[PDB]
Design a protein around this ligand. Structure first.
Ligand SMILES: O=C(NCc1ccccc1C(F)(F)F)c1cc(-c2ccncc2)nn(-c2ccc(F)cc2)c1=O
Ligand SMILES: Fc1ccc(-c2c[nH]nc2-c2ccnc(F)c2)cc1
Length: 329
């Protein structure tokens, strides 16, 4: 065990190892401080989880979160530098702190040149290929979930309405949506980077879908055959039929290859959207694409998601993950 020190930071105590110095509050959801990591010489972000073990739900969320962050090992996905607790045993274990690279800013704080959009969208797809290869769905892709440093290097995390980037099938509350909902979000972000405007700034879920169908058109026959819900079908079929808009007209002035890729990402029927791996080979990324440097992820065991355990059990599991953590090289 290293040596800890305690300080108060905005009605919130912090007990961190001496390796982390000069803590400076940085914003809240858990609470986060900037620090300097004396072991590496790097600026780090330290998140203290709040009430990680208050309820079975929080406890399982805490475990979720730590297992996920321990597994993500890719240049365009947030990685875990360190995890620690000031607790000396399972008995006294109550607090969890996560350490990551301090990221410059988000995508939210930044119309962009076509080459900038190429590189940023490339990095998102490259990270998402990786995430999707472990059978994870991000589900919350939006500019504020993308950290971008001054070199335009990009990492996906999960800390402007979320709903504006959500796939129309989620708006429709389809129970079996899949990983292509993330590709939808990337299409919405890409559009926003090209035009400087939110593509679908819906005020709620009804308005969200309405704006979506305005661009992409009402469901064709092939898609309507896949809808099980009678109510959803009455809704859909009762709408004034709209054709898919011409994306060339709508995005006139934008690189035709960016237009082509948007067409491939924002297809209404999710079975027809381009995957992340396919999008990487798209001609729009010829500057960047390297098929031998787009790794997939180690197998990821998410079987714990189906399990119903006591709070102390999820707490014990989390402690095990804390203790087993091996820092990155
Ligand atoms: O907290 C989170 N990030 C920020 C973070 C972390 C550590 C150290 C300092 C910070 C600071 F300082 F940047 F916030 C985070 C949490 C959860 C999560 C997951 C499941 N349940 C609950 C929460 N997931 N992702 C995530 C990662 C990759 C991905 F593809 C999708 C999401 C996160 O980045
Ligand atoms: F108005 C609509 C109708 C269908 C969608 C949709 C897009 N991709 N997949 C679906 C879908 C598939 C199976 N069942 C559902 F309920 C939805 C989105 C909005």
């Amino acid at each position: 065990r290293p040596t800890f020190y305690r300080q108060e930071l905005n009605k919130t105590i912090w007990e961190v190892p001496e390796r982390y110095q000069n803590l400076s509050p940085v914003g809240s959801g858990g609470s986060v401080c900037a620090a300097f990591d004396t072991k590496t010489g790097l600026r780090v972000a330290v998140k203290k989880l709040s009430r990680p073990f208050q309820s079975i739900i929080h406890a399982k969320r805490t475990y979720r979160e730590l297992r996920l962050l321990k597994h993500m090992k890719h240049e365009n996905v947030i990685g875990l530098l360190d995890v620690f607790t000031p607790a000396r045993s399972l008995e006294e274990f109550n607090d969890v702190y996560l350490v990551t690279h301090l990221m410059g800013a988000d995508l939210n704080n930044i119309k962009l040149t076509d080459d900038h959009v190429q590189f940023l969208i490339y990095q998102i797809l490259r990270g998402l290929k990786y995430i999707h290869s472990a059978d994870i769905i991000h589900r919350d892709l939006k500019p504020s979930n993308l950290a971008v440093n001054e070199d335009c290097e990009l990492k996906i995390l999960d800390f402007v309405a979320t709903r504006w980037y959500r796939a129309p099938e989620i708006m429709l509350n389809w129970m079996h949506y899949n990983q292509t909902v993330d590709i939808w979000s990337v299409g919405c972000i890409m559009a926003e980077l090209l035009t400087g405007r939110t593509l679908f700034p819906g005020t709620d879920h009804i308005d969200q879908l309405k704006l979506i169908l305005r661009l992409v058109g009402t469901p064709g026959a092939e898609l309507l055959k896949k809808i099980s819900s009678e109510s959803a079908r009455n809704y859909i079929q009762s709408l004034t039929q709209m054709p898919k808009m011409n994306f060339a007209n709508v995005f006139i002035g934008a690189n035709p290859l960016a237009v082509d890729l948007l067409e491939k990402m924002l297809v209404l029927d999710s079975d027809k959207r381009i995957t992340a791996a396919q999008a990487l080979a798209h001609a729009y990324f010829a500057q960047y694409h390297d098929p031998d440097d787009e790794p997939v992820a180690d197998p990821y065991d998410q079987s714990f998601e189906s399990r119903d355990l006591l709070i102390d059990e999820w707490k014990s599991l989390t402690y095990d993950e804390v203790i087993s953590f091996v820092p990155p090289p």
